[PDB]
Design a protein around this ligand. Structure first.
Ligand SMILES: CCSc1nnc(CC)n1N
Ligand SMILES: CCSc1nnc(CC)n1N
Lengths: 300, 237
């Protein structure tokens, strides 16, 4: 179990770690988060008490380095940094633990939620969507736009999700205009899975990462990407059986975790009704359909 | 974007544009089977592709063989329409290709857009006008060439005959849409109006009678009367 220490907490802020969150008051002695489960990516995220504008945060994996948080009063935000001196770090942490000012990552033993939300998410793939190669961790916030959004403006600060566009030369073969538009199996299996993602695990990892950025930061382009990747599978008549079963589990846990009061802005009525009731896969998402119907029957 | 009453003069400017109407592409008769079930039998159809500035009509005849062994024909018909419009544009010299294509029914937008994806600079637009181009099969010579076709065929017409020698495109289109609106609301009466006087004839190379200017005013008046009437006969006013 690993630790992300904080130099201090000079401004009042709500801190998230994965699906958990807690309030820290201005200049309240706070020294970080301990007992973080090894084996998963994590996100530590922030919403200042004085400006709910800009949720922002950092994706990281404690196996890749020793990371800490330090408020920067010039740029006005909590920044993740890497400590390269290993003995300095162990020494800082051990002292803060001995003084008991660290929230304990509060995982219930039975609870597989975070695993289920991040099953296919890898740091190395995050770092290709979020390009900033001098750090081992990745910054995301509410306002960052996607490559595709910028095509329809600062490239260094973009989310480089894979571009999916159903009315595009990539999506539609010369001569199969109707066939490929009404059944996207070509685009899913040949163009995207075999060509771009290489396997379904990388496809699911980007889908899950897009969802989590939508949920935690309100990132609109991430929500668009999540729905596009769902719709591309549901609109394919020919999908490997193992992918459909895994997709149902993925979405089930995403819908289960979504804040009930954010469903109005984070769920696209058209995609979900098409996917669950009209598409080729309308009968292949049993778990997802059951939870959607019992939790958000208004949307449908 | 969408074409409506407020941007109506754009039809007669100097940017090449085409209307595409798919109403008459898939046409059927519905009948009883020997077992007392219902079946359809397809008849020849046509795509109505019209330059409203010049009157040039590209009438692509859709022969019933194109439906043989196909399913979901009303959906296929929109994609076949877009394939054929696509093929027509690809056959025209660059300087004759349209800068916009206006579809009369919104269900044609996605099929045409997908087919034209490599013509990124050709705008595909809907319209809010309720245009009467479905009545094109009430023009006898167009109906005749569609029903007689034994194979796929493109036939070129000028739907304005020689009117542009005397009137503007705006006025010619207004006359065309009035004639077709009348033919759509009450075909028998409209056709009676157009041929009542046996001394006014249709030239071999024309679609409509050779009316003088004064006779067109009378004709156009009679068509307006018919349309308002039928609207009484229909709604009782
Ligand atoms: C959320 C900060 S963690 C923390 N804050 N005060 C104490 C002492 C009870 N403690 N363990
Ligand atoms: C899907 C883009 S549309 C398109 N691409 N190549 C052609 C020539 C048949 N065409 N119509």
């Amino acid at each position: 179990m690993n630790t992300v220490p904080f130099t201090s907490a000079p401004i009042e802020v709500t801190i998230g770690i994965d699906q958990y969150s807690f309030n820290v008051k201005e200049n309240q002695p706070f020294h970080g988060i301990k007992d973080i489960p090894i084996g998963h990516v994590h996100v530590i995220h922030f919403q200042h008490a004085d400006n709910s504008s800009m949720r922002y945060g950092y994706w990281f994996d404690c196996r890749m380095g020793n990371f800490y948080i330090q408020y920067d009063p010039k740029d006005g935000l909590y920044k993740m940094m890497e400590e390269r001196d290993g003995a300095k770090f162990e020494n800082i942490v051990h002292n803060f633990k001995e003084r008991q000012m660290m929230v304990s990552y509060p995982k219930i033993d039975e609870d597989d939620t975070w695993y289920n939300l991040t099953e296919f998410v890898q740091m190395d793939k995050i770092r290709k969507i979020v390009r900033k190669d001098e750090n081992q961790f990745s910054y995301v916030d509410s306002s960052m736009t996607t490559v595709q959004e910028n095509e329809l403006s600062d490239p260094a600060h973009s989310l480089n999700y894979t571009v999916i566009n159903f009315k595009s030369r990539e999506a539609i073969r010369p001569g199969h205009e109707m066939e490929d538009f009404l059944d996207k199996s070509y685009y899913l299996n040949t163009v995207m899975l075999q060509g771009i993602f290489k396997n379904s695990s990388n496809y699911f990892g980007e889908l899950q990462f897009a969802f989590l950025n939508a949920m935690f930061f309100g990132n609109y382009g991430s929500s668009l990407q999540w729905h596009a990747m769902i719709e591309l599978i549901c609109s394919s008549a020919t999908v490997p059986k193992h992918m459909l079963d895994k997709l149902d589990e993925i979405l089930y846990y995403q819908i289960k975790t979504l804040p009930e009061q954010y469903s109005d802005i984070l769920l696209n009525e058209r995609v979900w009704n098409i996917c669950l009731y009209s598409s080729f896969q309308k009968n292949s998402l049993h778990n997802t359909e059951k939870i959607m119907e019992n939790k958000y029957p208004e949307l449908l | 974007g969408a074409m409506n009453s407020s941007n109506y003069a754009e039809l007669f400017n100097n940017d090449i544009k085409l209307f595409v109407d798919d109403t008459n592409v898939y046409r059927v008769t519905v009948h009883k089977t020997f077992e007392g079930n219902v079946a359809t039998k397809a008849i020849n159809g046509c795509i109505f592709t019209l330059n409203p500035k010049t009157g040039h009509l590209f009438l692509k005849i859709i022969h019933t063989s194109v439906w043989a062994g196909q399913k979901r024909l009303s959906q296929l018909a929109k994609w076949k329409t877009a394939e054929e419009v696509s093929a027509l544009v690809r056959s025209l010299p660059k300087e004759e290709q349209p800068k916009q294509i206006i579809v009369t029914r919104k269900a044609m937008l996605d099929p045409l857009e997908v087919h034209m994806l490599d013509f990124p600079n050709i705008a595909i637009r809907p319209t809010e006008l309720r245009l009467p181009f479905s009545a094109a099969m009430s023009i006898d010579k167009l109906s005749d060439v569609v029903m007689k076709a034994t194979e796929p065929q493109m036939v070129l017409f000028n739907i304005y005959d020689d009117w542009l020698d005397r009137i503007s495109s705006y006025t010619a289109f207004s006359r065309l849409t009035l004639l077709l609106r009348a033919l759509k609301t009450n075909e028998e009466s409209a056709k009676m109006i157009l041929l009542s006087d046996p001394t006014i004839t249709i030239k071999s190379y024309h679609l409509w009678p050779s009316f003088t200017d004064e006779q067109w005013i009378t004709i156009e008046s009679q068509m307006r009367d018919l349309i308002l009437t039928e609207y009484g006969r229909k709604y009782n006013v």
